[PDB]
């Protein structure tokens, strides 16, 4: 099974490239979007935790609108990354869900990211609200200190599917080289045992960069590129990423 | 830990090095291929002597070596007779194999010879000694074209290659599952972490195994293989491009 957002088909062919916009102010968001317009990527993620007036609903709504007017032909992924999971700032559970609910309502986003450990009830209800409006859900988990056991990585991805994720997503930190292989093993076992939709997996940092290139073989449907600055350690430039993915796709 | 220098090429340092394989049945074929490989971006030229027609006729093999040398003057040359049992075109007795390799050593035209791990300990060890006496380096190899042994066994083979005096142990295996590719990488990592005191080269074959040709800098493989122009085999140019991207990440 594949996932179609805007006109992009996730789940077939080469891995798709996601890039993240980080803007403090609306002026920053518009300027970064103008700089991104021509870059070669497939999905634009707006990292809303980097945005100053996240707690002000009209500011957020305006920002999304400015992005949508500059980048008109790419699916837009709305993502508030909690400090819990390596983000720039914390919000109460209630604020977090309401922010995502407001993003769904806006009619300006194609996807929203929901963290798996947010809470089962809330996540289930927010998934429901998103689908109610044809908004897809990337469900996510990040472990910035370590790489859990392969089996644990697999059960979290399986749990995302049960919660109704259109695309499960997991990012883990390697402490050793073997940790990178653990992440790839888990991706393969997930694909073999439970996957019925695209999934996205990655090992972070310089040591896991290989994981950001082999998804076509091991099973990850997308990968994060950098336009100038990485949104998580290990991202390489968008141009180099497309070059490598194409080469491997045709290998 | 050691690096291994062949001419001006330092193996075991920085980005993995690129090896290309030249195949020719006659001296005319050899010259044609050498000419075509001349301006391509690779590091070590491996001559698959097993493709050459009458290997028991020493002078012909030697005249072909000379030709490759005259056309490709800067790159290190690796002399490789890949035996029948490991994917090679033709049979030689152990004695013939050893004599061939010593002739290549004696010629002064080659920088390195390939000796198979499974050739026979006594024979291999003396020939390793003979190559070294002549400043010729040794890549000790095992190629399994149909399956991927268990990690413990891949590691055991690599350890033995070191025990036998290889300058550079080399193993190449065929995955039947994606897991097998990860097994080869796991073996590479355990060998680096725990027993390796010299450069090692490892590779999983086919399209599924491609990561293994790209990730040598992170996981521990000192060199990789590409085409001047086969599933999972990429061009020298594309391979240099990706290795550079990974190295500068
Ligand atoms: Ni295609
Ligand atoms: Ni509505
Ligand atoms: Ni360098
Ligand atoms: Ni002598
Ligand atoms: Ni066999
Ligand atoms: Ni080989």
Curated annotation (Swiss-Prot), chain B:
Alphabetical list of Gene3D superfamilies matching this protein: Aldolase class I
Keyword Metal-binding listed: no
Annotated InterPro entries: 3-dehydroquinate_DH_AS, Aldolase_TIM, DHquinase_I, Type-I_3-dehydroquinase
Gene Ontology MF term list: 3-dehydroquinate dehydratase activity
Description of how activity is regulated: Inhibited by (2R)-2-methyl-3-dehydroquinic acid.
SUPFAM superfamilies linked: Aldolase
Function: Involved in the third step of the chorismate pathway, which leads to the biosynthesis of aromatic amino acids. Catalyzes the cis-dehydration of 3-dehydroquinate (DHQ) and introduces the first double bond of the aromatic ring to yield 3-dehydroshikimate. The reaction involves the formation of an imine intermediate between the keto group of 3-dehydroquinate and the epsilon-amino group of a Lys-170 at the active site.
PANTHER family the record matches: 3-DEHYDROQUINATE DEHYDRATASE
Name the UniProt record assigns to this protein: 3-dehydroquinate dehydratase
Organism: Salmonella typhimurium (strain LT2 / SGSC1412 / ATCC 700720)
Name of encoding gene: aroD
